[PDB]
């Protein structure tokens, strides 16, 4: 009579499933890779049928690993990348691809075929663009829809359903076509605060046809996370997954936002739900999303949103990011000529490259409180792939100072430390921007890459002057999705309730001394000056 | 603490297991592998697809174990006896009517080469005495004759011809060394003379395979547990998330890995396994029936005797049934009542086997009357031909006692008839071994069937032999891990790894004389069905 809940997370590379008990402890997990197709540059495609098979196999293996009965599984939640799934009028895969294969019916979030369409949309200056900083991205869905209407007219004539990936999953599981407020508000321009598609936008950009039949093709009904769909797991989906028909299924959510649910509510007050007002979520990895919520709407330069009820009801979401975080740290580490020799030594000692570099840093520092100061004369402007937040300029580039003609592991370690600090300083700039525009953030909840690196964590806390709180359960997106399942099943009455019950703080890392904090204040002055210097070089060259 | 990985690539999935030094599994994972069936009798796979599944399975299994890769000291690989074809650069080269190079593996169960096998058999070459007198189309030399005849463009561009398990070890280590198991069992290598027989390849139209010192098929051949290359290559280690140089054993065929994983368990009172009395029954999709002796026994319709194909200085007599798990699952899953029963099984927290076993129990009244439910329902189980001891790939299945009824009771009875038909086929093999040098009265059994109490008890009842079930039923994974311990130098020989890392967990014995006599009568019908089938064939000529 003990109950379990499953979260499913469909990432770029794999579909993953986790089985959780009622206190949020993971008792089972499994993974299946999903196939990627890259027919030409900027084109990145997947197959919805391949993904669904991956999800079903992952779920079956996780339940088996958990060693529980299917009647014990009482709720499912699904999250995925914000990719685009195209189906015909019968619900079957319909090609989006130069290959013509109907199997290739998913335009992956990271596909950039629709750059031209995004530029056309942006030129209209339509009001709904104000929620994406006035500049729609080619990754978002409406540019992609316009691209398909233009370049794949036969597909366009035969469309029955245009799903954000998370919504495809819940539809495939339940037959219910209802869409999530998350995908639709964040990525499709749905006005969460007016509960509607804006027909003026769709007409203006040349997508007027999507609104026919009560907007059947894109979402006639749109609901909050935690709401149960259809009559639960369909007979078909239950047989495919090895579960019980009717098992509750929540409305879907985008992957990063699931991560946020997974961690943002882990309470610092015994026997209360968490206070969100002063927290930011850092969803780390190769890139990082910076997510906070307010009771009021704030349009913040360089940050996306405000998106109403995109995660929690009666909260407006603001979302910033850094495009290369783990990716930048790995670029700096892996490009250094000492890398291969140090990697080999690390592997042989059963450590990660980060643990090996951290060891070097500790040795160079003498005592640990001196680690931050090792970069007193070495600075980095981290915008190697532009800056997303708060500068919103994809054309910015990186700078590194303090370079010497030395190629030792010590030099590599210093460059890695400078990278961590630059990224932490960029996080400080995002938090500061939010705090000048409606927030009072003083605490960071973190998940994903970097959270198992003690120097990464500590220097984020030092640079921002905010505590970094690390989760008991590392699997934030699977856990957040499972929490949605509990709400859909009625076990908890609200997401904040589920979050408080199913996540907790595993470790609190506070900023250190005033000396260390003041050092970062000076580093931050350099961080800002480097941007102005960059702009000055550009001016001089003109 | 030290750990060891077994990789087992079966018909449907690549699996990986992480074992401790006592042979307990501490992590596992699986990945499906793609099957292609261009037309009847043709069954193909992709080596690239297989390798990716293996790597992902290994990465996942280690992650589940939650150990550090530096802790993994040895790996062993086992696979089905499928044929992997690569070109001069080592890339997939098509074996398919589809002409797709991705389709470069002829799966063990493929029967495309029936006529080539017949032609080889008509030669009566001496090497045939070591496959029971009759080469199977499932074996590699018939398939190689088939490719040479049908696909000259492929044959022209061949660089490597690998039994799947040797493909795995080569991919992992860069060493092209072949295993004694794969070569002796499936390629006609003479384990007792340590060489290829040039007179066989000549006579059979494959002399060209022996060029450049047998480079295409294997110039160097070694026993299991020998370390290959200098352990994992940097690339394979990277691909699997392990440490370069980790020891990798010479490969082994899957059924043979299971034998290593179980046959050697000491008895419940301390005694050494006794190979005169104990056979390994290695279950799964298909089942192998493995007996070893210090002496050579030639047995018509049973593969072998194969010298040093599993243990050094032992001859292996290898029987088998080509469809066992596959047949049970075919009979269950093809029945119209399956989806409804599966749903009710899940509602009770049961497998489909437990749900059928319950129906049988209800229908019989008492548990001891279950066998008699098929008094008028009989099956000849040769759906994919018979491997042993008839050795005839042309044989087919028969089911009697059919009615219009489509109920869960009908489904359960047909499932029981299947189990019993497989048990009677096992009896036929065991009786044949006992006419040829053995005194088998016990089966050491592995595989999914062994978690089904009706499958286990009716095998014991039909054969008169005790069923011994191991503590770890994943015998193939465990045997491969054991080989990893030997390549790592942790145990000196396979027999000491076997006794340290496997143990008995259950002993199930035959039941009453009334039940035994019933199976004696069913066995008369089982034999009669074969003669009946041949008589239909005669009448149709
Ligand atoms: O590899 C296969 C398929 O599992 C068979 O087990 C061999 O034919 C046994 O020799």
CATH domain class of the largest domain in chain A = Alpha Beta
Q: How many domains make up the coordinates of chain A?
A: 2
Helix content percent band of chain A:
25-40%
Assembly status: homodimer
Pfam family, one (chain A): FGGY_C
Protein name (chain A): Putative carbohydrate kinase
Domain Carbohydrate kinase FGGY C-terminal (chain A): 282-489
Family (chain A): Belongs to the FGGY kinase family.
Description of the structure:
- Two copies of one chain form a homodimer.
- With 542 residues, chain A is of the alpha/beta class.
- Chain A is 39% helix and 18% strand.
- The first copy, chain A, folds into two domains: 1-322 and 472-513, ATPase, nucleotide binding domain (Nucleotidyltransferase, domain 5); 323-471 and 514-540, Up-down Bundle (Methane Monooxygenase Hydroxylase, Chain G, domain 1), CATH 1.20.58.2240.
- Chain A has a seven-stranded mixed sheet with strand order 15-16-14-13-19-20-21, sandwiched between helices. In chain A, strands 1, 2, 3, 5, 11 and 12 form a six-stranded mixed sheet that branches.
- At the A-B interface, strand 3, helix 1 and helix 9 of A face strand 3, helix 1 and helix 12 of B.
- The structure holds D-xylulose.
- Residues 80-81, 108, 185, 253-255, 285-286, 288, 318, 320 of chain B line the site of D-xylulose.
- It is classed as transferase.
């Amino acid at each position: 009579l003990a109950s379990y809940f499953i979260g499913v997370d469909v990432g770029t590379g794999s579909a993953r499933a986790g089985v959780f008990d009622l206190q949020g402890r993971m008792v089972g997990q499994a993974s299946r890779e999903i196939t990627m197709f890259k027919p030409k540059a900027d084109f990145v495609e997947q197959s919805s049928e391949n993904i669904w098979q991956a999800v079903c196999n992952a779920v079956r293996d996780a339940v088996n690993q958990a060693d529980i009965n299917p009647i014990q599984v009482k709720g499912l939640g699904f999250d995925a990348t914000c990719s685009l799934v195209v189906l015909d009028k019968e619900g079957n895969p319909l090609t989006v691809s130069p290959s013509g294969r109907n199997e290739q019916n998913v335009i992956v979030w990271m596909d950039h075929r629709a750059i031209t369409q995004a530029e056309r949309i942006n030129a209209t200056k339509h009001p709904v663009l104000e929620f994406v900083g006035g500049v729609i991205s080619p990754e978002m869905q409406t540019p992609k829809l316009l691209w398909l209407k233009q370049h794949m007219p036969n597909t366009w004539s035969n469309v029955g359903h245009l799903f954000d990936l998370p919504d495809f999953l819940t539809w495939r599981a339940t037959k219910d076509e209802t869409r999530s407020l998350c995908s639709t508000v964040c990525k499709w321009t749905y006005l969460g605060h007016e509960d509607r598609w804006d027909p003026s936008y769709f007409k203006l950009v040349g997508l007027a046809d999507l609104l026919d039949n009560n907007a059947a093709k894109i979402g006639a009904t749109v609901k909050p996370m935690g709401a149960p769909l259809g009559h639960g797991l369909s007979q078909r989906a239950a047989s495919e997954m090895g579960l019980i028909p009717g098992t509750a299924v929540s409305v879907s959510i985008i992957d990063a936002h699931a991560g946020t649910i997974g961690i943002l509510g882990a309470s610092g007050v015994t026997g209360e739900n968490a206070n969100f007002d002063r927290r930011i979520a850092l969803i780390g990895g190769t890139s990082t999303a910076h997510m906070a919520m307010s009771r009021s709407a704030h349009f913040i330069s360089g940050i996306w949103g405000p998106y109403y009820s995109a995660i929690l009801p009666e909260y407006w979401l603001n979302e910033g990011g850094q495009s290369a975080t783990g990716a930048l740290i790995d670029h700096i580490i892996q490009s250094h000529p000492c890398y291969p020799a140090l990697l080999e030594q690390a592997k042989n000692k059963g450590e990660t490259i980060y643990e090996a570099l951290n060891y070097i840093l500790r040795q160079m520092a003498g005592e640990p409180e001196n680690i931050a100061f090792l970069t007193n004369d070495i600075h980095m402007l981290p915008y190697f792939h532009g800056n997303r937040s708060p500068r919103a300029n994809p054309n910015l580039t990186g700078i590194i100072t303090g370079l010497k003609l030395s190629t030792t592991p010590e030099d590599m370690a210093l460059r890695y430390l400078a990278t961590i600090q630059a990224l932490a300083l960029g996080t400080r700039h995002i938090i500061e921007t939010m705090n000048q525009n409606g927030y009072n953030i003083d605490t960071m909840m973190a998940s994903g890459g970097g959270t198992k690196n003690p120097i990464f964590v500590q220097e984020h806390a030092n640079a921002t002057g905010c505590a970094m709180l690390l989760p008991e359960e590392s699997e934030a997106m699977l856990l957040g999705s499972a929490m949605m399942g509990t709400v859909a099943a009625g076990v908890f009455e609200s997401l904040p309730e589920a979050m408080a019950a199913m996540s907790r703080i595993g470790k609190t890392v506070t900023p250190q001394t005033n000396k260390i904090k003041a050092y970062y204040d000076r580093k931050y002055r350099v961080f800002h000056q480097m941007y102005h210097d960059h702009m000055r070089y550009q001016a001089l060259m003109q």
